[PDB]
């Protein structure tokens, strides 16, 4: 399979263009559109990469195009660990979908935050807030595909199944790729010498939801997460040989570009994925 990487949350991790040029990644998720819903003006946060005011982040379209030209799919990730995002009603789900269509997808807007490039899809990293309406938001985004160009839908649920926030949305069967976060969650992550919890969880995910492909999401360095880091050798010798048996296996997902560079994680596992 391939590696999905998240980019955006550390100004020192390189440009989107550089990130794609590594040839290590097949999917790039831009993190994050962390404020939206409830009448708020949506706002993108890309840490020190750029300031979205006055079109300061439109420069990112150069990288988006550069990635796409190389066959890499680029998604805008909603949510994250920090943010006041939520959906207040089904109407809010519709307003948000329309805003996303016009500002990041095939629609039209005078103030597209990342410029004129058209992103491949939308990634859902909903970690707190409202548990309602994410399925409607997925439906409304998916309907825009009917205009001709596919809007990919991807999701980053946490490993305990089912996910309190994304369970219903994942049940719609609309998601193309689901990179489950097998960390920061004791009952379903790796712990020294024990791979049972992670495998058992992987089995639940791959047999329970209908999505195109499911990915094993991991922290790329011990600093990238509170818990659940898996040393490369253990992944390669014990985990991959098992999870690759599933026909739904798509690859591995890592948080994040910054930590991957520091720890050389994808460099170590690339050919085994
Ligand atoms: C306020 C804001 O939007 N951003 C902050 C930025 O917050 C980052 C960091 O706290 C990240 N922490 C680490 C260790 O990288 C944090 O990463 C979370 C992420 O939200 C979750 N989603 C995933 N996926 C795999 C999808 O994984 C987890 C990881 C933890 O593993 O994300 C927050 C933003 O949500 O912090 C910077 C630097 O301090 C600050 O400038 C500002 O940019």
Curated annotation (Swiss-Prot):
Keywords: Carbohydrate metabolism, Chitin degradation, Disulfide bond, Glycosidase, Hydrolase, Multifunctional enzyme, Polysaccharide degradation, Signal, Vacuole. It catalyses: Random endo-hydrolysis of N-acetyl-beta-D-glucosaminide (1->4)-beta-linkages in chitin and chitodextrins; Hydrolysis of (1->4)-beta-linkages between N-acetylmuramic acid and N-acetyl-D-glucosamine residues in a peptidoglycan and between N-acetyl-D-glucosamine residues in chitodextrins. One of its GO terms (biological process) is chitin catabolic process. Its EC number is 3.2.1.14, 3.2.1.17. GO terms for molecular function: chitinase activity; endochitinase activity; lysozyme activity. SUPFAM superfamilies: (Trans)glycosidases (SSF51445). It is an enzyme of class 3 (hydrolase). Pfam families: Glyco_hydro_18 (PF00704). One of its GO terms (cellular component) is extracellular region. Disulfide bonds join 20-67, 50-57, 159-188. Residues 1-273 form the GH18 domain. Belongs to the glycosyl hydrolase 18 family. Chitinase class II subfamily. Two components of hevamine have been isolated: hevamine A (shown here), the most abundant, and hevamine B. This is Hevamine-A. It comes from Hevea brasiliensis (Para rubber tree).
